[PDB]
Amino acid sequence: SGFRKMAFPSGKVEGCMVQVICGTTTLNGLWLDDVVYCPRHVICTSEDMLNPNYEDLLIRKSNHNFLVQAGNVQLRVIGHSMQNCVLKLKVDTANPKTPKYKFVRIQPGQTFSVLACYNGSPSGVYQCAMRPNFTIKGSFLNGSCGSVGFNIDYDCVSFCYMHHMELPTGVHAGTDLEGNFYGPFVDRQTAQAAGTDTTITVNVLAWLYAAVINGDRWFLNRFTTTLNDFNLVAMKYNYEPLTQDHVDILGPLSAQTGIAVLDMCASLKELLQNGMNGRTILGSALLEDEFTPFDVVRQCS
Amino acid sequence: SGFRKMAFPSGKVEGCMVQVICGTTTLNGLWLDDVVYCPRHVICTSEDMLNPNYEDLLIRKSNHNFLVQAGNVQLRVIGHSMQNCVLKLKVDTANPKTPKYKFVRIQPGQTFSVLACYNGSPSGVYQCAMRPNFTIKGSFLNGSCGSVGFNIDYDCVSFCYMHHMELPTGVHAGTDLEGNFYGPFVDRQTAQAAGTDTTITVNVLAWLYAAVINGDRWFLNRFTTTLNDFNLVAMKYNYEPLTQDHVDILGPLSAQTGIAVLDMCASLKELLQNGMNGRTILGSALLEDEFTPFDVVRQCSGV
Numbered sequence A: 001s002g003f004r005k006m007a008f009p010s011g012k013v014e015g016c017m018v019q020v021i022c023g024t025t026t027l028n029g030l031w032l033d034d035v036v037y038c039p040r041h042v043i044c045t046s047e048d049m050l051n052p053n054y055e056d057l058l059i060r061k062s063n064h065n066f067l068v069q070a071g072n073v074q075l076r077v078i079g080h081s082m083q084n085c086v087l088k089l090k091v092d093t094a095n096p097k098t099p100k101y102k103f104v105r106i107q108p109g110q111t112f113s114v115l116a117c118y119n120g121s122p123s124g125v126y127q128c129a130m131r132p133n134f135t136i137k138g139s140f141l142n143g144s145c146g147s148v149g150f151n152i153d154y155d156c157v158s159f160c161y162m163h164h165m166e167l168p169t170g171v172h173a174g175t176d177l178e179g180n181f182y183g184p185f186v187d188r189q190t191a192q193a194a195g196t197d198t199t200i201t202v203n204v205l206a207w208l209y210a211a212v213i214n215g216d217r218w219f220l221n222r223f224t225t226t227l228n229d230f231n232l233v234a235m236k237y238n239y240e241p242l243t244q245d246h247v248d249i250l251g252p253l254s255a256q257t258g259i260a261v262l263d264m265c266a267s268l269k270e271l272l273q274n275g276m277n278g279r280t281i282l283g284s285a286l287l288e289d290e291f292t293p294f295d296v297v298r299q300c301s
Numbered sequence B: 001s002g003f004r005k006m007a008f009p010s011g012k013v014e015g016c017m018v019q020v021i022c023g024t025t026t027l028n029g030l031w032l033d034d035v036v037y038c039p040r041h042v043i044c045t046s047e048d049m050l051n052p053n054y055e056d057l058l059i060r061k062s063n064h065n066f067l068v069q070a071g072n073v074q075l076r077v078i079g080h081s082m083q084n085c086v087l088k089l090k091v092d093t094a095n096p097k098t099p100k101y102k103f104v105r106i107q108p109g110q111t112f113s114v115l116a117c118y119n120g121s122p123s124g125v126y127q128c129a130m131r132p133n134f135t136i137k138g139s140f141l142n143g144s145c146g147s148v149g150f151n152i153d154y155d156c157v158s159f160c161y162m163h164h165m166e167l168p169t170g171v172h173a174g175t176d177l178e179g180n181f182y183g184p185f186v187d188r189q190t191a192q193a194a195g196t197d198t199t200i201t202v203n204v205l206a207w208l209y210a211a212v213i214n215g216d217r218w219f220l221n222r223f224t225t226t227l228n229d230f231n232l233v234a235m236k237y238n239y240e241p242l243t244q245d246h247v248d249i250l251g252p253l254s255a256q257t258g259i260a261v262l263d264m265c266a267s268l269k270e271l272l273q274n275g276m277n278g279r280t281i282l283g284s285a286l287l288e289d290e291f292t293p294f295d296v297v298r299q300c301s302g303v
């Protein structure tokens, strides 16, 4: 048993991380086939960052302005192009360690693993989730731009995130591997603030089901609730509204434990009202919201 | 900024995980050079596990009782021997993906990454600590026996743990890569429980320093305690004693924040008595103790 926040084995992503240098800038790149993906703000000076004209800055760049290093091997850039906020460096060598991969855009509440990298060198891996305000609560230092988030299914690596910036509140914003930002954020040094963050309700419910599966039942009660009555209460605690889609994806966990989804919603309503009272659930003194219903069936059932 | 429970990149270890079958038992092995390491209890049946005579059981076994699958490529076992509780299986081929490595034994309070595997295929990675009662609070399902714990220094993998069994309270027991158990446990189906666990005090203090570094500062105060006054309070809440060596390694965090160690102990003592009751620190409603001072420095300042 036991239930921890497991990240995916990072081996297939480590083999793709490289260092991209342009002028005074050093950040990370993702080497897949003969393409290196990195944030397009690699081409900026600090003065550009307030209102960068990325099209104007890139057209002034030549291939030899970009220094790419994979280990002790320096790759030769033979071309470049921009796709949304991601720069794509064509190189004369395909990465022999290129795994089976594909690019995906995830939705809030979805989880993935982050391979934090510095100077193209992987340093640590951790699991996190896309927040409802489209930020992630990562751990990033200066130099970590270009780090990627991912899931691995069987042997296919689905890249879903590339790290671009840290917001003033210490939270992090980025793009998918097609250069499209998650949320209303831009790669500009102007004033940007994430909206109010909320708890991922469907993930908390899935986590309570995993608690019942592992033998924790102290929080259940004899109550039920309607869907609308639950949302009116939960939204008073800054929880995300639960939808019928969410009710449906919890069915397998409801059928495995014999506890109806709206019955577990009644338990959560009471937990929000009473707190933990010194107790814990799966070793946590608060309600965890970064385990998806999919993740629960994976590590548990 | 930000702080999360961070594991080492597991790639150098993923390339060493193989599957080991003996009869009906299936678990994981560590393939380094031309030797595959795995728990010795793989040779036991359910009736054997009740009171095993390992030297007799292994003597009556053959190289042909060991099926070793590395991905889809079979590995011929050309020899076998026991070192303590770890079975060593000589194979015909050295592992081409063998990293620079060494076997080390860790102490309670030290942390390491665990690559949980199932049928020789890596499934997930997570960071944990060797508890003071020599257990680890891991996440293991059926078939994870043989998963290893490790740290990485530069390019060198320091293997420190191999998973053997789960205890009745849901915690886990295992050995170093030389077969020596962590804690007072034996690899036999018998009645064994873990001792009263305690909180790793030096790790909590380092974690509170990481909180200060990230802007969570409400728990600070102007007061100082003594190492004797603090340890008298710590023993009452099942906290490990704070030694002078623990204060010394918190030194870098003390200088970088301006919070002397015994000031942070005054903050910790007040948190121990007055509780938290839902108020959080680094998004946690309890005191985390699975980050060493070195973990904090590596993650918060990249030193």
Ligand SMILES: Cn1cc(-c2cc(-c3cc(Cl)c(F)c(OCc4ccccc4Cl)c3)c(=O)n(-c3cccnc3)c2)c(=O)[nH]c1=O
Pocket: A024, A025, A026, A027, A041, A049, A140, A141, A142, A143, A144, A145, A164, A165, A166, A167, A168, A172, A186, A187, A188, A189, A190, A191, A192, B001
């Ligand atoms: C040259 N250079 C720069 C970086 C790098 C750039 C950034 C970064 C990227 C962009 Cl597009 C920005 F608009 C930006 O201004 C943020 C800001 C400031 C003031 C008001 C509002 C806003 Cl929004 C910052 C970064 O946030 N980080 C980072 C730091 C800590 C944790 N995580 C990410 C790092 C790098 O890694 N390597 C490298 O060579």
